[PDB]
Symmetry: D2
Subunit: 410 residues, 4 copies
């Protein structure tokens, strides 16, 4: 009894000390050290993935200080000569474990070869096979327990970092736009990952990727931060698309025409766009539009009810805006997205993720510049990651992106 309480208090103290090093300088935890200690067992288990995560964190710190890019790629011999880390994506835990075992085997073989040699070692090159591994945690697809168990599996199998997306689970298509989850759902997934890492006692890095730039749908409107980017219909006489297609289910090649007719009938606009295009019809001009834009902007986290209230106070009328009739067949709301939505999502995800990852359909320096500026204006010391969806001036472009703040690209 007394020894049990003594070791529990010692574990709480060591967890609190563990949260004081510069590793967690910008990590936001909603759980107390007592909860993490209670979640742990009576046998303290250490994982080499924690050491790999420490190595990756130190590498990213060095690259951020030096404003240099850490090259990555999706054969272990040449995966350590030219790379600093390996990103694994599609199962995925099996790939991570196999790669970790291969790296350990090659490191063991190299050390056996080198130690048996006593002058000739200087001529023999050294290869650091122990490259930190970034694991894509896209095999959960349900709730929070799945991501907890996935984080446990990744930590046990040597992953130094875990990557998750705000894309809706079970919605990837071979593609008519991506489907997002509310910001709070992705924040909860990140918090679950961090809590699982704390339970396992690992320094595992959390990597969050936002797919809002190319996304066209969102699962729910429950989060106010998304309300700015939700597309609704400004035509009160337009019925629901899903109901219209259900009651008129004609060939799909001809249903594409009914969809086009409905889309033209109801002006699909954002609420701020709707009030802007309505306020141009009737002088009241610059002052009220400017103040509405200042108070209702993509980075304002303003709920749609508050936006309607402000429009009523300014314009003087209740602007019609129904985003339910624009829902897809499965109920996904139409979503605008864009670069500013990506900036908002990255700012929201920064307290819970070590790396903020932005996807791009095409290479555009201006988009990366504005995303980096927004994220580093909200959270200055936030590491950023960049990639392109699947010339010779790519080197200088990568160098410029690294100078922007992107310390992890592939």
């Amino acid at each position: 009894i007394q020894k049990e309480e003594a070791d529990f208090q010692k574990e709480v103290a060591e967890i609190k000390k563990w949260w004081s090093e510069p590793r967690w300088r910008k990590t936001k935890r909603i759980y107390s050290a007592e909860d993490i200690a209670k979640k742990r067992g009576t046998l303290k288990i250490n994982h080499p993935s924690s050491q790999q995560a420490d190595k990756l964190f130190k590498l990213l710190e060095k690259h951020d200080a030096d404003k240099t890019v850490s090259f990555t790629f999706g054969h272990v011999a040449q995966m350590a000569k030219y790379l600093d880390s390996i990103y694994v994506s599609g199962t995925v835990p099996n790939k991570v474990e196999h790669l970790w075992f291969a790296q350990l085997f090659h490191d063991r073989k190299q050390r056996e070869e080198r130690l048996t040699l006593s002058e000739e070692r200087a001529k023999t090159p050294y290869i650091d096979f122990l490259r930190p591994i970034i694991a894509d945690a896209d095999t959960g697809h349900g709730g929070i327990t799945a991501i907890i168990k996935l984080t446990k599996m990744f930590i046990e199998r040597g992953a130094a970092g875990i990557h998750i997306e705000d894309q809706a689970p079970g919605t990837k298509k071979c593609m008519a736009g991506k489907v997002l989850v509310p910001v709070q759902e992705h924040i909860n997934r990140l918090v679950a990952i961090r809590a699982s890492a704390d339970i396992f006692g690992s320094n595992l890095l959390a990597v969050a990727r936002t797919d809002s730039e190319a996304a066209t749908l969102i699962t729910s409107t429950i989060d106010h931060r998304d309300h700015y980017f939700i597309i609704g219909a400004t035509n009160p006489e337009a019925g629901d698309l899903a109901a219209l297609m259900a009651e008129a289910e004609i060939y799909g090649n001809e249903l594409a025409a009914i969809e086009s007719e409905w889309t033209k009938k109801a002006g699909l606009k954002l609420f701020h766009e709707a009030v802007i295009d309505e306020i141009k019809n009737g002088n009241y001009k610059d002052a009220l539009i400017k103040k509405f834009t200042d108070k209702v902007n993509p980075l304002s986290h303003t709920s749609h009810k508050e936006a309607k209230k402000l429009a009523k106070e300014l314009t003087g009328k209740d602007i019609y805006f129904n985003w339910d009739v624009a829902r897809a067949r499965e109920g996904y709301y139409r979503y605008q997205g864009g670069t500013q939505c990506a900036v908002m999502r990255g700012r929201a995800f920064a307290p819970y993720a070590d790396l903020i990852w932005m996807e791009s359909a095409l290479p555009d320096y201006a988009q990366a510049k504005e995303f980096a500026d927004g994220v580093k204006a909200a959270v200055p010391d936030q590491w950023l990651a960049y990639n392109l969806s699947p010339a010779d001036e790519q080197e200088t472009y990568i160098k410029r992106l690294g100078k922007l703040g992107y310390v992890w690209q592939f």
Copy 2:
């Protein structure tokens, strides 16, 4: 070229003939035989799970004709003396494959022992280890491709039947009510299961379980058939619960008080309940209430807009009803459920499932009777399954349930 078209046409013809036997007497397929033939490969693969599914279908036909129950349970030696089938639930494909291999091994051993004996076989009892296996397909959790691959895996691993629920994926809790998916989502999952079985050329049975009786939440309001059972707030002055808890995030033990205060402030009622309790205030009585109930009933599949239109035509006023403010933190709409919702869901799932499964929190003969009466009044020859959530008069209760139409219980 010519041989390729010849074998493709022969495959289409054999698929069309395969869909003519009494096995698919009440199976609704949205795909053509051409699509199923095109989805198949150049190597025709037969699975013993198809024979097991045929055996299970014949057994269920015999039990339905005899109005007898097929006992089941969640050790293969005593799993064939007292049972006709085995239901496997939680991974699950691994359990199904292991059980199938064990059954095959025991059958092989029994036949080896019997064939080596030439009079003494009559004294030796015979055990039919080849019991059809019902597999719980709850490991997908995302989209339609996952359930397709899960059906393929179950067919390859000897499953004679696949069971799915309309409960929301990744929402099971250790429980503040279940979360449902729209009826069309479960119908799509059933159609995907049937299409996968047709692609693999298996007679695999589809078992659909509805959890609407104990459910309290629904993921989306996109399906009109669910609109009757969606709970909304009749108080125009009540704000969103999720927003209120976000802006007031006080201890949870005290947040339980804010939730109670909000719940009391806004009358959480169904729309038909709202118009009933409003129409009692002011005579217009029996005739219009009766006609509204006849036109707006749980088994009417009436959209909420149509219900509001009928109420406006009858009552004369726009009854306030906002189900968005009653959403949970993650965006799940409040759902009523009940036995009539289960009847509606079972009627909708009957064309796509061989077995319709109803869950019960507690054993109630009246609830089972009314569910069976509704389902067999819509679809007469629909097999039913019954189970209780985890005395001596259980035998007569089981016999009565079998006489009702439940041919599969455990």
Copy 3:
């Protein structure tokens, strides 16, 4: 009872008919059809691996008739443009299953792409991804039950052929010569493979590789057919090597000297070599040496006792020959091997294997020619396989080897 005996007799009849087609024209079975039928279960299971084995057998028949080589290699897209089969070796069942699934998936995708196109198919090339797979069954390492289960696993996972070696299990080294098993042990393994294939009802091909050419050790002297190739000491005053090294276990670099001294002290010769080098000392010349060589030759299957008896009848003295003192530390007898030992082993393995495989340390046309001549002089219609241990005139060399009788090379 009556139906059970009826179906058992029908199964026996269908097995006997199955053994009458030209597939088993040269297959020797020690088990009766009754035993195979009794080993089967009550559920007849068909495997696509049987169809793949039929395809491989037909391909090998065509190549043997045309005296052409079937190219092979140890990426499924280019594994079907340039190859007729794939050999899988190192686990191995997992590789076979993964490759089989990949081939099925690619075939399915190709047929989906082609069937959706109705003229343009002629321009589109056709790729036969369903290449027969040869599986290396080297993961058993113990007894006969292991090879039975391994054959079952390979048949279930799509293997069209199984390859085994006469090398001693658990003796491969990274190499101071290979260790062989007695001929009867490999024959028993081949018989077990054939019996397992008959139990599963598959036309799976058995491939037997002999490693006797480069082998230097043999596990046992129990088989008379090996007695000709066993190395013994002709010096009666030489003690056991293993005992000498046990009682003198000095540094290994110096133990290499004790081994050399012992090897020089005792003349390590074959018994026929010993009697030849002894009969040269003292005239008795051509006639008796010639008759001894005719009666004691590598392809005579003469036991060592019979050889000693013949030498005593001819020479007149008991020639000293002790092969126990030449055993290794673990008890492996010294073995000569050579090409004639390979010919003897291939002749012994021919009744039980569809393909006879000969390994070569270096490419030598004379060695392949003599091996092929011996094997096809014993069993004329025996398919042969050739490979080299791991220029531009390789094409004509392969063509010549194919004309010799080698129908499967890689």
Copy 4:
């Protein structure tokens, strides 16, 4: 370079210190600390199985000091109330990993339940789910690399101890006696296990079981320590059994008669038995028989050549003894075994195994007493294990066996 040598020397020093604690007080290592350090990688990995092995070693030390038995058995809830350890045998690594995960999960759940309670903990019982696991390493079946990898897998999956047998791999039958390997082969397997544990840096216990008491065959005669127990034929006119059965392969039911006739024709006796029964025919009596028995005894490790030399010096004639004609069909030599052979094998295995395990066909107190006396007379502080092949006075029998020196029974 300099840091590499520095850390290598530090690792060698820490390995040498690790070998100084009372854990390795009686452990014989043939490898140097330099070899173990060179076999390790650049990433030091710690396993909780090492802590479990430490716990098991401390438990066995306490039981040996207290002369008490550690009960074991082949449900984790009741596996910790009544047991101190769990032995896992038949795959087996998968069972060990599953049991280890179950134990960790139950320990985690228990600690979560207890820590959330702050007085009421005293009433709540405590269950130590972390029971050390003994793993049966019988899945290698080939060479030394297999047992090395198996030891690595067991250490990684939470095994606190590894058990191996001297029975021949791939020879277990459902039984006409067990087949043994030479003593040196089992010693090499134990040394490989210890070397693998040292490479992984684990305190894993090695458990060695000898099956010589019930064994009737031995794979090889290469080890002098086995030469005393090898059965040979004393009839010079008897041919080889294997050759006789090969040339007379009549029904097996009638071959059982040929085997009996051959066995009666050739007196199957041990060499000491042969010289004893021959020296009784002709006085020379007590003195020379006594001195031969003293110099040629089961615990003398006398080679057969030395025994023949002593018999020739004493009796005056070369006693005929041929153990090759008594070999089985597969080449296994006839082996006597008995309790004295078990004592010899246990004495030989004691330097390399923490626990010496003796199997018994039937419970006999005298046999266990003599085995314990022999083993503890050679190596005094050697832990012993006892089990019976698969009443109320079993408690006192277990207590007596524990007082003998058996500290681990099940």
